[PDB]
């Protein structure tokens, strides 16, 4: 489906490409295969991201990466890519709003769930290759709000920083007040506990 | 990782150095040599700098800003505008012109910063190149007053004549390819 859409959206195929024209245009790779080149990259990239956030043609797991310095757009539909969900930031305002959390709060008898949040475009899944092209805010309120200017172009926000820890490290209380090797040791000891 | 900046040198210490000494490895990971200066050279920093220059390997590639291989049929023609003056001065009383002049020219520009840092002399470099390749290379060097340090190299005039009636059609490397090989060898193994 992605290849069909790319053909619709003014992507010249490698076979039809004059060799001279490649130099000034971005190369579009889909699953590691150089499909073609596109003369205007940013419009295509925005359209692909809109489609993924609406979940129309591009599934949520599909990751689009643009390397601006190297003039390459890479789209991976491959399996095995590890992804984490991140909130989406437009302008400097989080897309998640009080109406969304009000619907989620009454999750029972409203049939509003995480899938509705993904479909609404509030959250998105981002793999590491796409993480390289993403400006993230650890905490929304602190980093998004205007201060002495550090970054005014945040594109995503972390849901909560404590989610970087795994199952066994999540039982540690006050992990940030411990030495690191000690958290590593507790992760191993907690597997051997009795209960 | 947790040595100090006081050493100001790469030093292998700890278990890896113990293994190097225990196994008596032919090649240490960081071979080093501590040189103690005999007399006034130890007292004065400048004299120690002289000794350093004597002890540190220096090649033409380190002091060469850029190299260009030109084709100039006539040395008097001076295809490069800049070398007109000193080529004319040298050919006012030309040397080795009687044998011939090789048309292909190798022009080497030497960075003044590196040249003065190692305290090398243009005449010194010319002598070293002349000694290394014998008479097969003829070198022309600018005066130090010139803003750009230029060394002009041509194939041997006798070799250009071939000094042989048969002349042999082998034509090994012609002259341009031979000049490129000469440039690579000079840069890598000049040992000025």
């Amino acid at each position: 489906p992605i290849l069909e859409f790319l053909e619709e959206w003014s992507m010249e195929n490698l076979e039809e490409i004059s060799p001279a024209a490649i130099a000034d245009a971005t190369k579009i790779f889909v699953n590691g295969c150089w499909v073609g080149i596109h003369k205007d990259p940013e419009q295509l990239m925005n359209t692909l991201r809109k489609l993924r956030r609406q979940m129309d043609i591009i599934v949520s797991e599909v990751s689009m990466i643009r390397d601006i310095r190297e003039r390459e757009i890479r789209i991976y539909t491959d399996a095995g890519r590890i992804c984490r969900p991140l909130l989406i930031v437009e302008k400097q305002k989080l897309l998640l709003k009080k109406r969304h959390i009000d619907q989620l709060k009454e999750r029972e008898y409203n049939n509003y769930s995480w899938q509705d949040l993904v479909a609404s475009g509030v959250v998105e899944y981002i793999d590491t290759l796409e993480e390289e092209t993403v400006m993230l805010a650890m905490t929304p309120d602190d980093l998004q709000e205007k201060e002495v200017a550090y970054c005014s172009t945040y594109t995503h926000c972390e849901i909560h920083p404590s989610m970087i820890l795994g199952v066994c490290a999540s039982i540690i209380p006050f992990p940030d007040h411990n030495q690191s090797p000690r958290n590593t040791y507790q992760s191993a000891m907690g597997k051997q506990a009795m209960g | 990782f947790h040595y100090a900046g006081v050493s100001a040198k790469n030093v292998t210490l700890g278990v890896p150095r113990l293994k190097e000494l225990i196994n008596i490895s032919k090649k240490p990971k960081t071979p080093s040599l501590t040189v103690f200066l005999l007399g006034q050279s130890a007292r004065d920093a400048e004299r120690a700098k002289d000794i350093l220059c004597r002890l540190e390997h220096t090649t033409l590639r380190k002091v060469t800003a850029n190299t260009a291989i030109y084709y100039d049929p006539n040395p008097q023609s001076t295809v490069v505008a800049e070398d007109q003056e000193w080529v004319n001065v040298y050919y006012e009383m030309p040397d080795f012109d009687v044998a011939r002049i090789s048309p292909w020219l190798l022009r080497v520009e030497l960075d003044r910063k590196h040249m003065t840092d190692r305290k090398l002399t243009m005449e010194q470099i010319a002598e070293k190149i002349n000694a290394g390749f014998g008479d097969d290379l003829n070198c022309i060097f600018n005066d130090d007053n010139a803003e750009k340090l230029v060394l002009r190299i041509r194939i041997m005039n006798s070799d250009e004549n071939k000094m042989q009636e048969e002349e042999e059609v082998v034509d090994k490397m012609d002259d341009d390819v031979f000049l490129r090989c000469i440039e690579s060898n000079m840069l890598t193994d000049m040992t000025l």
């Binding site: 030495q179 690191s180 | 990782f1 947790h2 040595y3 100090a4 900046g5």
Partner: peptide, 8 residues
């Protein structure tokens, strides 16, 4: 975890 000269 301390510094460059110390320990990690």
């Amino acid at each position: 975890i301390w510094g460059i000269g110390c320990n990690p």
